[PDB]
Amino acid sequence: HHWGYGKHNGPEHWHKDFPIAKGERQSPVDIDTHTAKYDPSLKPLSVSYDQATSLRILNNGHFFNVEFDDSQDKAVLKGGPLDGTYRLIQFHFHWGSLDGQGSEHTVDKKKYAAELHLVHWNTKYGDFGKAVQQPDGLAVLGIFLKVGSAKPGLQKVVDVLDSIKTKGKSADFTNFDPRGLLPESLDYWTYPGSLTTPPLLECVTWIVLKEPISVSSEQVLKFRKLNFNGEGEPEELMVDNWRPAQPLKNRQIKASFK
């Protein structure tokens, strides 16, 4: 039936409905830090989230999405390896059933507890749906989450999860500041890739930050109480909603630091 992360509709079956799954620039990948090329011509990242406008949070049956108002250049990403302005449209997470798994990207084979994706689309294309059809259409900022001390800025999100426990639920989620999810360093690795979920389009420029943010066991624990299933259906906990690393192929990973 519909795609998911279970043994019968998991990542290893996606190729049957989405042939692009076995493509040449699939994500995520394992970042080998020793072969990543430090590229000195890379510009620093420019994150302008000061006028961001969050609208809603939704449980889509795969993960939850916090959506932003992308009708104007409110929250944008520029610089780095990018050309043009990219608007933040939404962010989501991928997490595991345990602290030693959860992230999609890995660093030297190391998996983190979760991974945050800040999705932006190139304003040049007018809308998100057009942008996903272009090789430079999207820019996703990936941030690793490790278990340690609480991330104060993540609490608003953790607080509201009980209201969107099942598939299809959504809640008003205004006035959230995404700057609170950012680590203090903006050093990163960058490579051309794809969406990690169907349709798995190869329109993404990945910007994975080196420094992960720490969240508490309690904070992460609440993510794990979400449901994949719809209301009234048999409870299936939302865990391990991550895709395993794909072959890098004809691609080089560049770093903005040495």
Write out the catalytic residue numbers: 62
Positive or negative, the CA dihedral 79, 85, 91, 93 is negative
The count of other CB atoms within 10 Å of the CB of residue 27 is: 23
Strands (E), 96-147: 106-107, 114-122, 138-147
Whats the size of the chain, residue-wise?
Answer: 258
The two beta strands, 76-79 and 45-48, are antiparallel
Least Cβ distance, residue 40 to Zn ion (angstroms): 30
Peptide bond into 28 cis (omega under 30): yes
Nearer to Zn ion, 42 or 146 (CB): 146
Least Cβ distance, residue 232 to Zn ion (angstroms): 27
Give how many residues touch Zn ion by CB under 5 A.
2
Site string for Zn ion, 144-173 (x = CB under 5 A): ------------------------------
34 labeled binding residue? no
Binder of Zn ion out of 105, 117, 120, 243 (CB under 5 A)? 117
| Tokens 């798995």 found at | 200
174 labeled binding residue? no
Least Cβ distance, residue 116 to Zn ion (angstroms): 9
Phi, psi of 211, rounded to the nearest 5 degrees? -85, 120
Nearer to Zn ion, 117 or 169 (CB): 117
Measured from each CB, the residue nearest to Zn ion is: 117
Nearer to Zn ion, 9 or 39 (CB): 9
Least Cβ distance, residue 256 to Zn ion (angstroms): 22
* Token pair of 85 as six digits: 């302005």
Q: Which of residues 184-213 bind Zn ion (CB under 5 A)?
A: 196
62 binds Zn ion per the rule CB under 5 A? no
196 labeled binding residue? yes
Nearer to Zn ion, 51 or 106 (CB): 106
Nearer to Zn ion, 117 or 151 (CB): 117
CA atoms of 86 and 79, how far apart (whole Å): 10
Q: Which stretch binds Zn ion (CB under 5 A): 109-117, 156-164, 173-181, 218-226?
A: 109-117
Q: Which amino acid is at 116?
A: L
CA distances for 150 relative to 163, 179, 231, 255, angstroms: 22, 16, 30, 28
The DSSP annotation for 3-28 comes to --SSTTTSTTTGGGT-GGGG-SS-S-
Binding residues for Zn(2+): 92, 94, 117
By CB under 5 A, name the binding residues for Zn ion: 117, 196
Binding residues: 92, 94, 117, 196-197
Binding residues for substrate: 196-197
